[PDB]
Design a binder for this molecule. Structure first.
Ligand SMILES: O=C1c2c(O)cc(O)cc2O[C@@H](c2ccc(O)c(O)c2)[C@@H]1O
Ligand SMILES: O=c1c(O)c(-c2ccc(O)c(O)c2)oc2cc(O)cc(O)c12
Ligand SMILES: [Fe+2]
Length: 349
């Protein structure tokens, strides 16, 4: 087999993109210039949710924060979090380290190559075509488990820059504390005991944080490709940092909305795992990512996942009734991923 990286392809001297990267005719109509889209301020916009008072001693103010978070989660399921408690300089260090790793030559990065055939899903990679369509997306990435610390395989983590492990480790620990805060507020929002949702997704012991650095090289025909296809996240929550190059779009009320770049914020997505547990109340929104011909875009997504086999995910009893039937059948996290991949494979077949 050939190992083709999109960064290599982007630098190979091509004029047009290979056919495998061109989206189906029906999808091309919704793809426009990301910079022109980012400038548009009409239509619904991704909400900015202020978490400053999420754990305030002042009850009215705390409840107001919880309600705003709850409301954004039932409606959009995605938002720009501000005053989230993660130090701004730590986030800049994490991004700088990721930028430095991706600036290494493809050859240096191949020393970290993943190997799906032997189950080595961590490391440097690019999505291999996995259905009859043969469709590929315009991005390379680096994926690794980031937390808990005892479950990490540090040997696969970038050794250049020298501070990648230190920075990424601190960031994951900070995000783990923020996930607890969020899970609690979302639990309260559904009328559940504060510790309910985090317990249901594994708690401190089994919830995993996976880091995925998404690298989107410049594209010569950005109107014909997607950096990441339309999808919903399978996690419980996802927290993402960006390098201020636009690209994230959200499918809201039947239209693709472009996310604006809100300084110092962290994008947070409610994922399929919480949507399933809340019986459809909290929303896992369909989203995608655009590429462009002017600037390399990079994002850092941390997925908070339940244990893949140990928990059977299904709507919580409290969220189901005669009048509110279960909107999802029971599946473990692995089974859910397989079902989404299976439905797509059958679709393309
Ligand atoms: O490779 C993948 C993957 C993985 O390797 C490890 C992991 O822990 C979770 C994962 O999740 C997969 C997935 C599938 C369909 C989706 O809609 C989605 O959001 C995520 C993904 O393809
Ligand atoms: O959206 C997701 C995604 O893209 C990937 C991923 C991981 C490894 C790969 O090799 C890859 O091609 C993709 O993992 C995820 C894990 C989650 O818990 C939730 C997600 O939403 C994703
Ligand atoms: Fe996503």
């Amino acid at each position: 087999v050939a190992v083709e990286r999109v960064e290599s392809l982007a630098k190979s001297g091509i004029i047009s993109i290979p056919k495998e990267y061109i989206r189906p005719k029906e999808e091309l109509e919704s793809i426009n210039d990301v910079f022109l889209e980012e400038k548009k301020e009409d239509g619904p916009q991704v909400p900015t949710i202020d978490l400053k008072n999420i754990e305030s001693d002042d009850e009215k103010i705390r409840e107001n924060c919880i309600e705003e978070l709850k409301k954004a989660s039932l409606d959009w399921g995605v938002m720009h979090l501000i005053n989230h408690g993660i130090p701004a300089d730590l986030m800049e260090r994490v991004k700088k380290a990721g930028e430095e790793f991706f600036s290494l030559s493809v050859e240096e990065k191949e020393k970290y190559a993943n190997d799906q055939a032997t189950g080595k899903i961590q490391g440097y990679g690019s999505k291999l075509a996995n259905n009859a369509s043969g469709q590929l997306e315009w991005e390379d990435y680096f994926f690794h488990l980031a937390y808990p610390e005892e479950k990490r395989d540090l040997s696969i983590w970038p050794k250049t820059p020298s501070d990648y492990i230190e920075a990424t480790s601190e960031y994951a620990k900070c995000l783990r504390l923020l996930a607890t805060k969020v899970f609690k507020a979302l639990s309260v929002g559904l009328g559940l005991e504060p510790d309910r949702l985090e317990k249901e997704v594994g708690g401190l012991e089994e919830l995993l944080l996976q880091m995925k650095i998404n690298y989107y090289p410049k594209c010569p025909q950005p109107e014909l490709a997607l950096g990441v296809e339309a999808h919903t996240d399978v996690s419980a929550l996802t927290f993402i940092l960006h390098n201020m190059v636009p690209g994230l779009q959200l499918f809201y009320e039947g239209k693709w909305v472009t996310a604006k770049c809100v300084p110092d914020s962290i994008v947070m997505h409610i994922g399929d795992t919480l949507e399933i547990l809340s019986n459809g109340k909290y929303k896992s929104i369909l989203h995608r990512g655009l590429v462009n011909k002017e600037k390399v875009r990079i994002s850092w997504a941390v997925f908070c996942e339940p244990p893949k086999d140990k928990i059977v995910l299904k709507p919580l009893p409290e969220m189901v009734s005669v009048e509110s039937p279960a909107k999802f059948p029971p599946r473990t996290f692995a089974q859910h991923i397989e079902h989404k991949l299976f439905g797509k494979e059958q679709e393309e077949l």
